[PDB]
């Protein structure tokens, strides 16, 4: 199951946005991008399994990179804390 909250922007969200841009630059579809900012709202999904136990998270962010707005989804595994870029699409309209 997934449960949801909005988290505020600050260094943690800035670094999620920078992670997303670095990961997208590995793929190369949009050429080389450079991070500009994360804007509100930042969604945090917590993924539960079994007896309402956290398996991991997904952060869904609007990120300006190279002056274009993208939607990035980043997974984070609870056990390992490992993060991955799941989706990076755009450009997209501002929220």
Outline the secondary-structure elements:
Blueprint: E1 2-7, H1 11-27, E2 35-49, E3 53-65, E4 68-77, E5 83-89
Antiparallel strand pairs: 1-2, 2-3, 3-4, 4-5
Protein name: Monellin chain B
Organism: Dioscoreophyllum cumminsii (Serendipity berry)
Keywords: Taste-modifying protein
Give a description of the structure:
There is one protein chain. The chain has 95 residues and is of the alpha+beta class. The chain has a single domain, classed as Nuclear Transport Factor 2, Chain: A. It has one helix at 11-27, and strands spanning 2-7, 35-49, 53-65, 68-77, 83-89. The protein has a five-stranded antiparallel sheet. Strand 4 and strand 5 (83-89) form a beta hairpin.
Give the strand order, joined by hyphens, for the main sheet. 1-2-3-4-5
Number of strands: 5
> In the CATH hierarchy, what is the class?
Alpha Beta
Tell me the fraction of residues in β-strands, as a range.
over 45%
From the N-terminal CA to the C-terminal CA, the straight-line distance is 25 Å
* Radius of gyration computed on alpha carbons: 13 Å
Name the CATH architecture. Roll
Q: How would you classify the helix and strand content by structural class?
A: alpha+beta
CATH topology: Nuclear Transport Factor 2, Chain: A
Overall 3D form = globular
What's the main sheet like? Answer: 5 strands, antiparallel
PDB class: plant protein
Keywords: Sweet protein, plant protein
Assembly: monomeric
Entry title: Crystal structure of a single-chain monellin mutant C41V
